[PDB]
Ligand binder design. Structure first.
Ligand SMILES: Nc1ccn([C@H]2C[C@H](O)[C@@H](COP(=O)(O)NP(=O)(O)OP(=O)(O)O)O2)c(=O)n1
Ligand SMILES: Nc1ccn([C@H]2C[C@H](O)[C@@H](COP(=O)(O)NP(=O)(O)OP(=O)(O)O)O2)c(=O)n1
Ligand SMILES: Nc1ccn([C@H]2C[C@H](O)[C@@H](COP(=O)(O)NP(=O)(O)OP(=O)(O)O)O2)c(=O)n1
Ligand SMILES: Nc1ccn([C@H]2C[C@H](O)[C@@H](COP(=O)(O)NP(=O)(O)OP(=O)(O)O)O2)c(=O)n1
Ligand SMILES: [Mg+2]
Ligand SMILES: [Mg+2]
Ligand SMILES: [Mg+2]
Ligand SMILES: [Mg+2]
Ligand SMILES: [Mg+2]
Ligand SMILES: [Mg+2]
Ligand SMILES: [Mg+2]
Ligand SMILES: [Mg+2]
Lengths: 114, 114, 110, 110
């Protein structure tokens, strides 16, 4: 059956939700770009830890037990939240940056040359 | 002035665009979850490299020269693209996972206790 | 005056980690990609110690005992898995470093 | 039979990297968070070598000369910055590893 993401939240929605979250706790002061980047690195580490002893040939994440699927959802989400916060703190329009990068990707890797 | 992301593309839009990109090049075969995760780690490295010698107290990424802003947009985008691909390859509904993680974040960090 | 202790050497660490793994029948888990992902995990744990540190507050030489203990452990975890990974790949890590430092001097002349 | 060379030791690497940095007046750039981010960069370069490697194709012992050269360099880059970071933090990395291995034995009894 086709796998799709839900239509919401959008990246702007996530930015907005995280900013409201941080602002309520007076955490803006901690959200300097290098702080957010190191926090991102920490969550990428937590993501890697889930996969480190999983063989490639055995069943994949669809088959993991419920607690491990929950942990996977959480870590993928933590990476995304910090990425969004970082992009916003740097005044980068992340959705449009992705459009521009995908165009660059198509030129670097034209279909006929692969 | 308020900083906002553009309303599109959405995360579903990005998933769709990346899948079409990969499928055209017969790259699905390379997109196993640990491959995508290691590729993500590589792009997080490229992102870190931009910041490694930047002092925190000096002007931030808004002030970087055009070539460095371009590189920043690209690396933030490459991290996001692989994160999206990874989440999709694991059948994780990334937007809804983020909603669930933000709820968890609010319980762990109630406003009155910070 | 700050120095590292003269032992263990990287070969000593290789030997100790191999014996640790072999006793537990863990060689089967220590494939290069598994060790690399484990390394990435520990790099994350290291980053976590620094992520919220302001410029004005004390630097790691001055960190309280609990935080210095955690720092020693994470720097050590990164090193142990790096050693294991290099050994699993049959890379002579000490000599590779000498070769890399020479390359670094050419890339970065004074 | 696979062994690392007996030298350089971690103290030897510390010394060599400090002299490399000091000659170029780079101490000012080698603050702990800068070194940690640089380390993360090199971990990324290491990951890139493995990212598209299938299970069936040759493992790193068997990699062609160009790829083995790249592997040696990235493992070395990770180690050099890890050493620099530990030294900048006044952490006795060799002895920290001994302490961490003891902790590992208690956490993971047979
Ligand atoms: N200053 C902070 C601290 C947390 N957060 C948010 C962002 C993340 O989604 C999440 C990461 O913080 P966290 O304390 O590491 N919780 P996490 O669920 O990763 O559990 P552990 O790291 O304790 O295993 O809370 C934030 O936006 N700003
Ligand atoms: N198998 C692949 C290879 C690339 N891609 C896409 C995803 C990324 O946005 C981007 C990353 O691949 P890339 O070759 O590293 N280009 P990048 O712009 O990062 O430049 P360099 O790493 O060469 O500096 O192309 C993909 O989806 N699947
Ligand atoms: N399968 C394993 C498990 C542990 N180890 C060793 C290597 C590391 O020095 C350390 C990493 O294992 P670990 O369980 O993640 N301990 P850690 O100190 O990082 O505490 P956590 O916070 O991760 O629970 O033990 C190993 O070499 N192979
Ligand atoms: N400011 C610096 C620059 C380089 N170095 C040393 C440490 C590393 O072993 C290595 C990293 O610098 P580098 O320019 O990233 N070289 P690298 O071999 O990784 O090639 P690139 O692919 O990154 O251009 O030189 C340093 O210690 N301090
Ligand atoms: Mg966390
Ligand atoms: Mg987390
Ligand atoms: Mg790249
Ligand atoms: Mg890139
Ligand atoms: Mg650990
Ligand atoms: Mg650890
Ligand atoms: Mg480099
Ligand atoms: Mg390198």
């Amino acid at each position: 059956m086709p796998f799709r993401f839900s239509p919401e939240p959008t990246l702007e929605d996530i930015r907005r939700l995280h900013a409201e979250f941080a602002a309520e706790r007076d955490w803006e002061q901690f959200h300097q770009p290098r702080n957010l980047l190191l926090a991102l690195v920490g969550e990428v580490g937590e993501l890697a830890e889930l996969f480190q002893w999983k063989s490639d040939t055995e069943p994949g994440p669809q088959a993991w037990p419920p607690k491990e699927r929950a942990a996977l959802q959480e870590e993928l989400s933590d990476v995304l939240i910090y990425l969004v916060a970082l992009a916003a703190r740097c005044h980068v329009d992340l959705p449009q940056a992705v459009i521009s990068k995908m165009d660059t990707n198509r030129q670097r890797y034209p279909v006929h040359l692969s």
